Symmetry: C6
């Protein structure tokens, strides 16, 4: 990575940690925060190191390439390159492939990120990676939010854990997710809790809802 | 985090430690000191990293969002924003959402925390998180302090461990907790210890109480 | 902690280490050196972090509060506060509760410890903690030094291990402990070793005593 | 290694990590990113340390020597040495064997890498190592890309994992690999998925292909 | 410890390492190098931390106190204290108990060790500890060097391992140990190897001796 | 060690790593690179720490002393000491025993290694250690290179692993090892592979040889 702003290599355990996360948790939503955490201040080189260190899941890793390539092609389109000699003390304008690390050196990656003002190719690439990871998570989710329904003997707290887990891996803006909580959570609770929660009122908190069906 | 005052990312093992605590201990009271310890000097980014790294317990994690959102809305209310261009060498006035990390950059978070005088959004956000964690702990507590009663064969020391554990997860100011120790501890001890402890006197220490029922 | 003299947070593994010690070894005497080691240069915040990180043993942890509170009340008594505005470049006079961390900030704790001359609230609080830990160790000791007696087939070396372990958790000044070694160790050895050791002389070393009953 | 640019030895755990990778994963493709990661900024000494630390697999490790020796001989050919005394504040022109570490000191390796402009023998040697590792990976691959065929009951996602894993260890330029995905992936899917995917169109994404055979 | 020369506390893992060594290996000779390694640059405080962290083996740990106390009393005898006020920028003359850490502060320990010229109380105390550890090792050794005799079917290499292990824990100057190797090693080898080794000559190396009885 | 050039003690885990290598791998050839890696920049003190930390294998460790002593005696012979007072800002001429650490201080070891120009006693001692380790490895090797012969059903790749492992622990200059590969490898392959490899030609690569007997 680069940290306050001097360069270092990705640490054995930063890397090892990332691999064990992909081994154990596969593509659960918490993989992405974990990724962003382990990749804080990372160069494209460091970012590629993390992705390529994953053996197995090559279907998903290949989808991640396709996504990265789309974002790179879009970048090139939005940022058309200008020809000419690059002056002294200046950098070339980074292409999509320079950002993804495939056609830039570590030195150029350091040159862009440390520049005044910075050309933050680490953060621009990390965006595209996470963008593509969100697709993989959403795709590899087993369940649909419509099918989470409280069982007759199920403690309310467990149903809420199922619901909000399944909700975490859905393709929905916050407004669409707001509506699912607004509509489905109370609707698809079992007849006992369902009637209890309907009596609380339309603007009731989760804490209030969850404590309402505590003895239930 | 930020430490004496230069910025660094959350360490693999700081993060890993937090996750294992939420895995193993779920929401036992000692989770919160552990949290404050692992989050010493953390930015909102770092704070969000810790919370989002938790997969599972999404009922609780969702309650934590609701709490955070209430505190943010309250902040906005108490701190109404003033319009205008922000001058050179100055920051914008942070909103509730900038503090919670959702609408501020890492750079702005560093800008506020390092400023002269500082705008300590890390500590302001960490307050709200812990505030909301205390609710979760209190809610997820299995037992009520009224139901801790010494068994006829139970060594006094074990009863005190049950009592003060259950007391740790109660919604009570220190004065209310003072009263529970004052009243219930000796009251709900078994007839043998109960009479022993009544003979010691109303201002007797725990050490004195516990040693009084040692051979008992 | 603070170390040569700049501030840092308690490390994940410093903390984790402390917890595992309280998990595994409970309140064996070596807990206190371990504590002092893990708390070298700690602020009251750091000290509280360590104590509150312990879940379980709340009987003991509550005794530790009572002790801390007595020492704090005594401090307040010995150091009565003087009213007035605190001048520029100066600190307020720390109370008992500021030392214990409950009514002081991390900044004020750093302000006192780094001052010229220093107001070492970390070391003053660490004293009270260890003071109270010694009570817990002495209390939770299973055996009394009077009851350690060498068995007829017991190798002398094992009896000495029992003796000096039990001696380690006794409430005795060095002079009282000197006397126990002087009197009891040789007295309560078995008839064979007992007569052997009596023949060595009153000023004989442990090495000499232990090697005297080696073939015995 | 050398890092921003001062020298350090390879860390116990950097090394240990490399060994465990060669123990566990043998010569799976992800060994090479892992290698490049663990060898970021490494001197030839550090590079040799990593290779020689491997016991077992001496067939492969011997192939790696042969490859290294070919690249070194080629270097010598392309860079013929010029005789004369080396002036003050100057280095000798590195041979193939100086780059591979066998006939250069650690000091000379530091002298070349830190020079203005640098003579990056670490990166030149790391190239040859990876070059030779790619041969070993390609050689030790069990399966050929032509033989990956979806089974009648096989979920499409698993077939894609087999395909792109086997593709990762093939001797093929990106254009040749492009063609295999273009041709074989859809061709060698089972009759159900095969007809589904043919109906999508020739320019369909993996995501689209994989979701097309999700219920299939 | 103190390291190039600024003070730090003993690390969690430095300490943990020491404890695990005393747990696993008890008092095997390699404990002392391990000790010296883990105590490089340690203050008396740090040294005491290591010794007191050991629970169990209190017979041995008590012998270590007696030894330390003898060395301290001897120091006081050789270095009689001179009365008077200590001048500005000067230290008091350290007593035996100041060196052992019992009557000196951490600050005074830092004051002596960093002084110009230094008063190396860490190294003076570490001497006495190791002095006393050597007694414990020698005492707790199960076997005597006279009783190591090669068995009729025993490979020579195993007998040499027994011999030189037992030799490592003997009270003997290098000259006395030289003589044991000179005399006993070849004498107490079995009749086959014994006659072989006698034929080699009186000045034969271990390598020569060990390879002489390789097929034997 | 000493690193860019300031002194530090050997780390707990550097040491622990070395011990575990000698525990697990005994004296396999990869022990020596591992050693050189773990001893990069080590003082004689640090070097002795590593060797003495090994309990068990005292036959081998004693051979290592004999070797070290021969190299030290040779050094003394080649470097005869010159009498006189050592001037200000100058060091004494190091003897064999000063290099091996037995008659020099840590300070003098730092004085020699940091001097202008340096007297690299760490590297001079590390040479002798490795010199002696190579003898131990060669001695403790179970098999002779003449006895590695491919079995009738043995995959060629496994035979090459046996061959080049056994070759790694032989006393042979590169020219002698070149000849063994030149002669024995193809000679002692089984009749099928033997005839295949003879048809390839005298200058055929290992890769070519190994792929030639892949289907075989
Ligand atoms: Cl690391
Ligand atoms: Cl790894
Ligand atoms: Cl994986
Ligand atoms: Cl998944
Ligand atoms: Cl790759
Ligand atoms: Cl795969
Ligand atoms: Cl450029
Ligand atoms: Cl941008
Ligand atoms: Cl579900
Ligand atoms: Cl870390
Ligand atoms: Cl983690
Ligand atoms: Cl969890
Ligand atoms: Cl819980
Ligand atoms: Cl998230
Ligand atoms: Cl959940
Ligand atoms: Cl701003
Ligand atoms: Cl505030
Ligand atoms: Cl209970
Ligand atoms: Cl840590
Ligand atoms: Cl922890
Ligand atoms: Cl506990
Ligand atoms: Cl206990
Ligand atoms: Cl707390
Ligand atoms: Cl408890
Ligand atoms: Cl103040
Ligand atoms: Cl005081
Ligand atoms: Cl006992
Ligand atoms: Cl390390
Ligand atoms: Cl290792
Ligand atoms: Cl291996
Ligand atoms: Cl393989
Ligand atoms: Cl090697
Ligand atoms: Cl092998
Ligand atoms: Cl040169
Ligand atoms: Cl080049
Ligand atoms: Cl396959
Ligand atoms: Cl540590
Ligand atoms: Cl520990
Ligand atoms: Cl122990
Ligand atoms: Cl022992
Ligand atoms: Cl102690
Ligand atoms: Cl004991
Ligand atoms: Cl003084
Ligand atoms: Cl001295
Ligand atoms: Cl034996
Ligand atoms: Cl370490
Ligand atoms: Cl160790
Ligand atoms: Cl061993
Ligand atoms: Cl071996
Ligand atoms: Cl030793
Ligand atoms: Cl041995
Ligand atoms: Cl000198
Ligand atoms: Cl030399
Ligand atoms: Cl073999």
């Amino acid at each position: 990575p680069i940290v306050q702003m001097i360069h270092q290599a990705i640490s054995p355990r930063t890397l090892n940690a990332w691999v064990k996360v992909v081994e154990e948790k596969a593509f659960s939503p918490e993989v992405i925060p974990m990724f962003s955490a382990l990749s804080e201040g990372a160069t494209p080189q460091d970012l590629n190191t993390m992705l390529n260190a994953v053996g197995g899941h090559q279907a998903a890793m290949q989808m991640l390439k396709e996504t990265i390539n789309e974002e790179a092609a879009e970048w090139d389109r939005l940022h058309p390159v200008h020809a000419g000699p690059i002056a002294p003390g200046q950098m070339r304008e980074p292409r999509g492939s320079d950002i993804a690390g495939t056609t830039s050196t570590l030195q150029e990656q350091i040159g862009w990120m440390t520049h005044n003002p910075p050309a933050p190719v680490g953060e621009i690439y990390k965006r595209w990676i996470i963008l593509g990871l969100n697709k993989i998570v959403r795709m590899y989710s087993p369940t649909s939010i419509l099918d989470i329904r409280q069982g007759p003997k199920e403690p309310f707290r467990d149903y809420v854990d199922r619901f909000y887990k399944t909700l975490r891996a859905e393709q929905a803006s916050q407004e669409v997710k707001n509506w699912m909580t607004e509509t489905l959570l109370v609707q698809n609770a079992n007849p006992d809790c369902k009637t209890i929660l309907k009596a609380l009122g339309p603007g009731a908190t989760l804490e209030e809802m969850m404590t309402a069906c505590q003895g239930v």
